[PDB]
Amino acid sequence: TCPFYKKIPGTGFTVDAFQYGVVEGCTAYFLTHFHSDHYAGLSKHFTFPVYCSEITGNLLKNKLHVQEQYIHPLPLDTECIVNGVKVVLLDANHCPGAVMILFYLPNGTVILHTGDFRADPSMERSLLADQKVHMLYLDTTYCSPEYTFPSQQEVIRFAINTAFEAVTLNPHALVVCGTYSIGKEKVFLAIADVLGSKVGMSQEKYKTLQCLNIPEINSLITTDMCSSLVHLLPMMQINFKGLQSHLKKCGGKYNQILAFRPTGWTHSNKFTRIADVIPQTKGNISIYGIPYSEHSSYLEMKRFVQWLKPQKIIPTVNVGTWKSRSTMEKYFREWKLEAGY
Ligand code: NI
């Protein structure tokens, strides 16, 4: 049955609620972003109105074959009316096409649903600054103080210099980057760019990236693996067995793999700086786990909330255990007391 934190009070609306079948009384189904835990349930047989960004709409149409007449894409930063309720989509700084949703209820309440986000000070200067928010449905993925990680910029810098140095030392080295969904494109694209290569990938992945309105993407990606020295593979293949195997397939074009696993968080962050990251190496294969997150750190989250000062917070992640829920409510009270709201 649909959980309460996927329902928008005082409306017919749900958010990311597609795996429950017909939700009783739901007149519009909103989708924040094209990730499987959020979209699970959509297909060509879905006949209710879906509201989303243009990018997420491209992916519904082309990847899941949802019929066009049920896809209702909205522009960002624009006041729109859905079944008589004013709404706005804002950039979530997550994966391509990911949004937060502002709801203006007829009775005067204002609700922000963050979807999945990585909080940033730039959000303090969007349409959010213009009015008060009474309820916040918050992406609490990493809502605990142990979760620190570097900026996206610092991580990409590390990856670019690592890859450029390896390939300049050995021109027969191949670079491989793991993926399992949209998001984190900057990792493989930045590396390709510094090396003067295109990124080679499967036809299904190339199709996915073509849905995203990336500038000059036809210039950066390709399905011709032969012409490319950066390859994208599924994340599951990013291990010594998987990479030895793939290296076999390259026909003696390459004698060495350098591979990147962009992970969310890993416990080497409590100790290790980005400067001090090292690979796991076996034979002529090295694997780097790098902490490229598309979710808020604890501190980025705390700042955002202390800036917004909502009257009520409703967490949407890590809600399945009493110890989790209870710990999060304790942090919310600290933040509120410390900021004075
Ligand atoms: Ni997500």
From Swiss-Prot:
**Localization terms from the record:** Nucleus
Output the GO biological process annotations, alphabetical, semicolon-separated: cell division; double-strand break repair via nonhomologous end joining; interstrand cross-link repair
- Induction trigger: During mitosis. The mRNA encoding this protein contains an internal ribosome entry site (IRES) in its 5'-UTR. This 5'-UTR generally suppresses translation while specifically promoting expression during mitosis, when cap-dependent translation may be impaired.
Impact of altering D139N?
Impaired nuclear focus formation, reduced interaction with PIAS and increased sensitivity to cisplatin
Q: Which GO molecular function annotation, any one, does this entry have?
A: 5'-3' DNA exonuclease activity
Reported tissue expression: Expressed in brain, heart, kidney, liver, pancreas, placenta and skeletal muscle.
Q: Which UniProt keywords apply?
A: Cell cycle, Cell division, DNA damage, DNA repair, Hydrolase, Isopeptide bond, Metal-binding, Mitosis, Nucleus, Phosphoprotein, Ubl conjugation, Zinc, Zinc-finger
Specify whether Cell division is a keyword of the entry: yes
UniProt similarity note: Belongs to the DNA repair metallo-beta-lactamase (DRMBL) family.
Quaternary structure annotation from Swiss-Prot or TrEMBL:
Binds constitutively to TP53BP1. Binds CDC27, which is itself a component of the anaphase promoting complex (APC). Binds PIAS1.
Q: What name has this protein been given in UniProt?
A: DNA cross-link repair 1A protein
Report the source organism. Answer: Homo sapiens (Human)
As recorded in Swiss-Prot or TrEMBL, the protein's gene is named DCLRE1A
